[PDB]
Amino acid sequence: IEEGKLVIWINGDKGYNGLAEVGKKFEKDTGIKVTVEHPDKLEEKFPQVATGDGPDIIFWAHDRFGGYAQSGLLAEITPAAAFQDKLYPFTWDAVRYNGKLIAYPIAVEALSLIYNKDLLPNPPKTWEEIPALDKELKAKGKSALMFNLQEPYFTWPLIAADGGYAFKYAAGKYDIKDVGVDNAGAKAGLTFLVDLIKNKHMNADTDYSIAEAAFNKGETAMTINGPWAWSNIDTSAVNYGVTVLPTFKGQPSKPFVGVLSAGINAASPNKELAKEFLENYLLTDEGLEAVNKDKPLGAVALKSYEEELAKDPRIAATMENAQKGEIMPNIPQMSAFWYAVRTAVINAASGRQTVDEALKDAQTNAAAVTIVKPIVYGNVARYFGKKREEDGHTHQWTVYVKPYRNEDMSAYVKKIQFKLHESYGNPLRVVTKPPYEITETGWGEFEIIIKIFFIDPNERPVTLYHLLKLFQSDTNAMLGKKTVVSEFYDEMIFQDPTAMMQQLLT
Amino acid sequence: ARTKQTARKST
Amino acid sequence: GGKAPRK
Numbered sequence A: 001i002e003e004g005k006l007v008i009w010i011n012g013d014k015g016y017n018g019l020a021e022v023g024k025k026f027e028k029d030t031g032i033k034v035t036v037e038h039p040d041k042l043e044e045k046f047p048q049v050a051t052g053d054g055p056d057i058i059f060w061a062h063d064r065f066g067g068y069a070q071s072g073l074l075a076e077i078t079p080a081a082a083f084q085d086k087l088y089p090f091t092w093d094a095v096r097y098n099g100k101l102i103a104y105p106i107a108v109e110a111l112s113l114i115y116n117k118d119l120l121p122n123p124p125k126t127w128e129e130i131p132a133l134d135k136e137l138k139a140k141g142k143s144a145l146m147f148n149l150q151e152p153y154f155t156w157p158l159i160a161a162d163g164g165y166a167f168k169y170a171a172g173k174y175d176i177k178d179v180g181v182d183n184a185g186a187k188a189g190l191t192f193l194v195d196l197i198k199n200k201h202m203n204a205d206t207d208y209s210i211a212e213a214a215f216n217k218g219e220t221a222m223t224i225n226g227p228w229a230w231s232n233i234d235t236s237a238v239n240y241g242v243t244v245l246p247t248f249k250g251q252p253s254k255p256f257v258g259v260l261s262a263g264i265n266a267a268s269p270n271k272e273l274a275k276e277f278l279e280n281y282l283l284t285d286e287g288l289e290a291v292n293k294d295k296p297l298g299a300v301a302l303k304s305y306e307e308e309l310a311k312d313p314r315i316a317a318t319m320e321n322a323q324k325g326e327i328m329p330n331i332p333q334m335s336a337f338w339y340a341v342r343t344a345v346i347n348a349a350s351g352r353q354t355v356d357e358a359l360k361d362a363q364t365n366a367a368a369v370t371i372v373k374p375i376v377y378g379n380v381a382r383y384f385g386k387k388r389e390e391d392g393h394t395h396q397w398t399v400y401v402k403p404y405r406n407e408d409m410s411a412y413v414k415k416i417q418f419k420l421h422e423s424y425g426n427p428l429r430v431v432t433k434p435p436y437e438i439t440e441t442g443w444g445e446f447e448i449i450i451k452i453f454f455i456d457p458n459e460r461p462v463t464l465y466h467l468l469k470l471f472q473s474d475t476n477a478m479l480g481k482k483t484v485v486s487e488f489y490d491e492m493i494f495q496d497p498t499a500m501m502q503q504l505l506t
Numbered sequence B: 001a002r003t004k005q006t007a008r009k010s011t
Numbered sequence C: 001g002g003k004a005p006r007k
């Protein structure tokens, strides 16, 4: 990652232009250029890199930061007590993982019901009214309700209303063996969603763009969305209200509450510059104002500015919904939960599965523990000045497997076996301690079979296949006999590993 | 254990 | 085994 520069990653639905303005002010004072980017799937891309060209700062809801901290991707932020007192202590709790602060909290987010005051003067208090309301609106060429059915974030409040939950809290922590995805409450909620689609009140294909376009053109009376969505509605001709989500079975819809958070990349050489920008430029009245102006943040973590914005009824409604909802866990298993429920809702909504089938798989998938160990492997190969005439060897090479992160791989790896071509003596080379590598000379390329064994003999060994590369394929580097580096990134995946093995992997 | 379903990336 | 200068 380039030094004397800040690269920031924020999601494309947030005020990235507003953030850029805070970056320009930072550049004005320090001379340090801030580059704000909104890459697709940044929250999936971040671990793949973070890095070479990974960001200095990453923005997301707090739910994903626990997984990043487990992998060791985040720097422990070091805000002074004077600074911590300026933000709401609730927001600090959301960015804490294993007793340590791993991100700066920016703003509290919750979904609200947004409705067209011209089309729908009195919004419905219940989900159960919406079919009737839609039939009445369909007669006038309009629809009652359209929201993102592709992302479980938007459908969860309905699923959770009558008893759906992610992880049961027990013994002072989230119990990841107790998932609340296929109980009567969850089934009732998703069934109500599936029935809306079966009855033509909603369309399984509806995504963020379609719902937003539909509501903002006055085609649908209602949508479900967060504060970030208000800017585009302002630009439209729609008179909108932000209100409490409809009740289901007489119980409030329970949106998962998000704390938009800024993490500092552990690989960043600009940790001090990141601290300065986040503490003294973004998390200020003027800084949050520039971002909020672009796309509203919700209830900001900075007390001073939250008090200035608190009187906005749209924020009051946001916090009303937040209070009836649940703070998202930040634990690593939240990733698995979100993917499982995304599958369940899309399959149930499309009609590939029944509600019972879809939620039974999600129950299993949400509880499936996956531990990922990124690795690098391959070879370096150096050309001799000239061919050694005795055995015709032209190259010295090292084949190797290394952890991608700076860790002791021998904590979970028992041994690595490198199977060389028959032309070598003792072709089965076994390495029981690091470094996991074999150095040799030769004349020829050939496939090396690499077999990685784990301390738990029941944990199935990983087999890798590597073509030992001696000769450069690039023509200019071929003419120049330049040193060959053929190495590959890969991730070893451990599924529901034994208790012993989980400790060794973490 | 297993390798990720996503193809290996050259570095 | 498939060994050659380039494979």
Ligand SMILES: OC[C@H]1O[C@H](O[C@H]2[C@H](O)[C@@H](O)[C@@H](O[C@H]3[C@H](O)[C@@H](O)[C@@H](O[C@H]4[C@H](O)[C@@H](O)[C@@H](O)O[C@@H]4CO)O[C@@H]3CO)O[C@@H]2CO)[C@H](O)[C@@H](O)[C@@H]1O
Pocket: A011, A013, A041, A043, A044, A060, A061, A062, A063, A064, A109, A150, A151, A152, A153, A154, A226, A258, A335, A338, A339, A342
């Ligand atoms: O499955 C294919 C899709 O995978 C990707 O989406 C994943 C994410 O990688 C997961 O982290 C998770 O997403 C959660 C998210 O963690 C959580 O914060 C919340 O996201 C809100 C966000 O708080 C809010 O600020 C605003 O941006 O809306 C977001 C919701 O759209 O909820 C998410 C779950 O809906 O799970 C999803 C899988 O659903 C990838 O981003 C997609 O492009 C891809 O299709």
